[PDB]
Design a protein around this ligand. Structure first.
Ligand SMILES: Cc1cc2nc3c(=O)[nH]c(=O)nc-3n(C[C@H](O)[C@H](O)[C@H](O)COP(=O)(O)OP(=O)(O)OC[C@H]3O[C@@H](n4cnc5c(N)ncnc54)[C@H](O)[C@@H]3O)c2cc1C
Ligand SMILES: Cc1cc2nc3c(=O)[nH]c(=O)nc-3n(C[C@H](O)[C@H](O)[C@H](O)COP(=O)(O)OP(=O)(O)OC[C@H]3O[C@@H](n4cnc5c(N)ncnc54)[C@H](O)[C@@H]3O)c2cc1C
Ligand SMILES: Cc1cc2nc3c(=O)[nH]c(=O)nc-3n(C[C@H](O)[C@H](O)[C@H](O)COP(=O)(O)OP(=O)(O)OC[C@H]3O[C@@H](n4cnc5c(N)ncnc54)[C@H](O)[C@@H]3O)c2cc1C
Ligand SMILES: Cc1cc2nc3c(=O)[nH]c(=O)nc-3n(C[C@H](O)[C@H](O)[C@H](O)COP(=O)(O)OP(=O)(O)OC[C@H]3O[C@@H](n4cnc5c(N)ncnc54)[C@H](O)[C@@H]3O)c2cc1C
Ligand SMILES: O=c1ccn([C@H]2C[C@H](O)[C@@H](COP(=O)(O)O)O2)c(=O)[nH]1
Ligand SMILES: O=c1ccn([C@H]2C[C@H](O)[C@@H](COP(=O)(O)O)O2)c(=O)[nH]1
Ligand SMILES: O=c1ccn([C@H]2C[C@H](O)[C@@H](COP(=O)(O)O)O2)c(=O)[nH]1
Ligand SMILES: O=c1ccn([C@H]2C[C@H](O)[C@@H](COP(=O)(O)O)O2)c(=O)[nH]1
Ligand SMILES: [Cl-]
Ligand SMILES: [Cl-]
Ligand SMILES: [Cl-]
Ligand SMILES: [Cl-]
Lengths: 211, 211, 211, 211
């Protein structure tokens, strides 16, 4: 499962351990489907969340740095990210669509906002490359690059921590850009753990986007 | 893979996510085997441990309470255990073999130590059952049961946290009983992640039992 | 602040870092009291919990093993506990009061339950000491001791993790014995962080005992 | 204690809980100085690290985003940071000194590298302000700002996690800029916990800068 996000981003599921029944078993310490689903709903409605820690996902995510900065605040998870110390960074930036400013009256046209953002990221990358090609170490040269630069990372997260992520990021209070990533994560979670996901939405989910 | 431990215990692998290449990919943020193995050795010799967090195991363990008490100190992991509040606990106790006291001069024969331990656990269980059958709540009745009572749990742990567990518990300083569990865990880890395990032993393992 | 719990237990505050204003500052990234209290209520009502991580407590707790087993499931915290490998364990056991069985019809008198529990713990300790004095290693001898043995530990926990503890343990679903410890912890928390505590009760606390 | 770092940064100690004796007590589960220091050295030389979790610091740090990105990878800690969604961000950027490129042959003079970096950050901030003043939401406008923008955060971290931070960041392999922050953190740690710090350097510290 891979899902395009923003202009150049994505979320892809790399691997998964377990399923709805992993939670039921772990909860039972196990050596019918009606009862297994009822147990899942029971755990979720009563706040017994530890059984869902036995379901684990790994994702590969391509996202702008400002999104990754928010995402990496989720400590109960594992990350490995592309390094600007160790590699030349690619010319790939998130440029908002003109629809991104719908709702806001602006004293310059939304298409001109879009062009101003493109212009400055182009000048910044041009400076970065000039510095690199003059022998400035990569780890110093990259400091001129803007926060809308794309980066990539692997994320390994269990279903309990993923539910926390969805409560906080699949929600109107989160920045729109990370909401879009959260909606993709939710779609994948629903596909792999349908009983857990539906019970989550019904009983435990705290946000206001997923339905 | 299931391995008998002590007189009545076991360790069984329930599920696993990933393999040696999960660490190599996560480390590379990947979209030959000589080079993949060399990278693993490189990460291990230099202390780059986060890539190993993307390999995850779930075990089902049957162990005495005093062993479980030590094991559950490992916080960077997930546990679900049989409850003495919620179920009648089974008459199953760890009785040391007479060889357990080899090295120690004792003023009573090692076989008589073994019998004294059996005798007291029998009296304790008899009291527990008397209390249960008189209508004492299970959660109170069980408090008379000794620390050598067997319990069971599911344990979900990533390879980095598992390496920490092995450093501390597959080692002469750990209590012999948990060492035996750690040796089983190591065998399973070696089988599922041979490059990681061998690199761990060569470069990072801090204990004094595994070879 | 020290508070007696059960027959022989206690909870004592050893140290604390910070206060209500630590959360306000951390939240503001700070270089009036009406507004500082309003901010605390705001964070709590909206689920902004990370600012409360900057308030930290250390407690010294004396509790029976079966209570400690439940308590030590709280992973987002730090523990150091008395060792039965490293010391001779003291003859101190939790003996329920006869009022502990109020609500339950029992086919033996509650005072006789109390005596049966005393009798078995006395026999168990007598066996433990016999084994110790015959040269059995402490770490083996102790396995005959029951779960109502008292132990002692230091617990270092931040206010966010403490609120989670109180949601789960200051609640009717938790075992009565640990509820009594949780009520003491809550009293200390209220004393040291009154604005945070009152805002917690009003907006975020999930249990059904604290008022 | 406050220490200037880089051109415009700082590290300041806001609060601390405990001292060397907190570790000794927690380790002993306590109800002379020669022996207390010997215990600290003992714990450190043998890898008994949990007692140091009972010493906790809070710092206020002003650092460029690229430094903060590395720092916030340390998950076993607590953070609260200034938000570009919620505030107008200040015109403050890290401009490397010309000495930062000592060792590297560059095909443009180090002073001209310094000017090129200043020039691009000035153009970027000018764009950011133009967008803000045209009614673009702050959370979108800020995406044009470079990684050398200064940010500020509160960091609450225990001494065990701080030792891990120092092993990794007070070391030649870490980026020079974060090394400078780590050296300041080490100075503060040494001042507040001299026995722990000296024992750390002697027995456990894995880096190659602190002496
Ligand atoms: C709309 C929005 C606005 C935000 N604005 C800001 C801001 O202005 N500044 C800012 O710095 N941050 C901000 N954040 C980030 C926020 O403070 C958290 O870092 C982020 O939401 C991750 O949440 P978490 O701690 O629950 O997740 P994780 O770190 O994954 O933790 C998961 C759970 O584990 C527990 N936990 C983990 N570590 C600890 C610990 N050390 N102590 C106690 N419990 C722990 C908690 O129960 C937590 O819910 C914002 C987040 C959102 C959604
Ligand atoms: C031989 C032996 C004797 C022992 N004797 C005693 C004893 O007498 N009393 C006693 O109480 N305990 C004792 N322990 C338990 C020991 O104190 C640890 O709780 C246990 O070894 C788990 O280790 P850990 O913290 O590394 O593992 P985990 O808790 O899984 O943590 C893994 C890693 O995460 C980090 N970590 C996790 N949480 C935190 C945190 N809050 N702060 C900082 N870093 C964190 C550390 O880097 C740690 O190594 C003993 C252990 C051994 C092996
Ligand atoms: C009434 C009651 C009955 C119980 N019955 C049982 C039982 O029968 N069997 C049993 O095994 N346990 C039982 N428990 C224990 C329970 O499963 C938890 O271990 C305990 O409540 C601690 O909760 P916690 O994980 O929220 O706390 P902590 O471990 O302190 O974690 C705090 C927060 O950090 C987050 N967190 C920490 N680590 C992880 C992680 N690895 N992944 C995801 N999120 C994490 C979560 O947001 C969590 O709320 C019972 C608890 C209660 C209160
Ligand atoms: C020179 C250098 C280069 C780096 N290059 C890269 C890079 O190119 N890409 C990149 O993504 N990162 C990079 N890092 C970051 C690195 O991968 C770590 O995220 C960072 O060093 C924090 O280390 P930590 O996990 O030990 O600390 P913390 O996250 O604070 O954890 C402390 C300890 O707790 C334990 N721990 C905490 N959480 C878990 C968990 N979920 N599972 C198992 N154990 C856990 C471990 O014992 C750990 O040592 C680099 C770091 C350094 C110093
Ligand atoms: O919605 C938000 C706002 C802030 N932050 C965290 C991420 C950064 O560490 C810091 C500042 O982020 P921005 O507000 O600048 O995105 O707070 C989030 O995680 N989510
Ligand atoms: O080798 C040991 C010794 C102690 N402990 C922890 C477990 C308990 O929380 C406490 C006391 O354990 P015993 O020494 O009684 O086993 O310290 C361990 O984890 N391993
Ligand atoms: O109310 C409970 C019930 C269980 N447990 C955890 C503690 C043990 O690890 C295991 C079994 O505990 P008992 O139900 O036997 O107390 O589950 C709790 O933390 N709280
Ligand atoms: O020395 C380093 C290199 C990388 N990273 C982490 C931080 C980011 O999440 C990611 C990329 O950082 P840079 O290499 O671009 O600084 O890896 C570090 O923590 N320290
Ligand atoms: Cl490119
Ligand atoms: Cl049986
Ligand atoms: Cl005594
Ligand atoms: Cl300004």
């Amino acid at each position: 499962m891979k899902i395009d996000i923003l202009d150049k981003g994505f979320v892809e599921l790399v691997d998964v351990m377990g399923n709805d029944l992993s939670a039921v078993r772990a909860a039972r310490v196990s050596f019918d489907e009606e009862r297994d689903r009822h147990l899942i709903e029971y755990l979720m409605k009563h706040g017994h969340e530890t059984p869902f820690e036995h379901i684990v996902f790994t994702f590969h995510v391509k996202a702008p740095i400002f999104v990754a900065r928010q995402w990496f605040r989720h400590r109960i998870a594992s990350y490995n990210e592309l390094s600007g110390r160790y590699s030349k960074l690619s010319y790939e930036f998130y440029i908002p669509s003109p629809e991104r400013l719908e709702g806001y009256k602006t004293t310059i046209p939304p298409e001109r906002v879009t062009e101003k953002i493109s212009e400055i990221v182009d000048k910044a990358y041009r400076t970065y490359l000039e510095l690199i090609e003059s022998g400035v170490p990569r780890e110093v040269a990259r400091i001129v690059l803007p926060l809308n630069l794309y980066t990539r990372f692997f994320w390994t997260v269990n279903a309990r921590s993923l539910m926390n992520f969805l409560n906080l990021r699949a929600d109107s209070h989160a920045q729109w850009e990370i909401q879009q990533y959260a909606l993709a994560i939710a779609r994948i979670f629903k596909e792999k753990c349908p009983w857990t996901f539906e019970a989550f939405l019904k009983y435990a989910y705290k946000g206001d986007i997923l339905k």
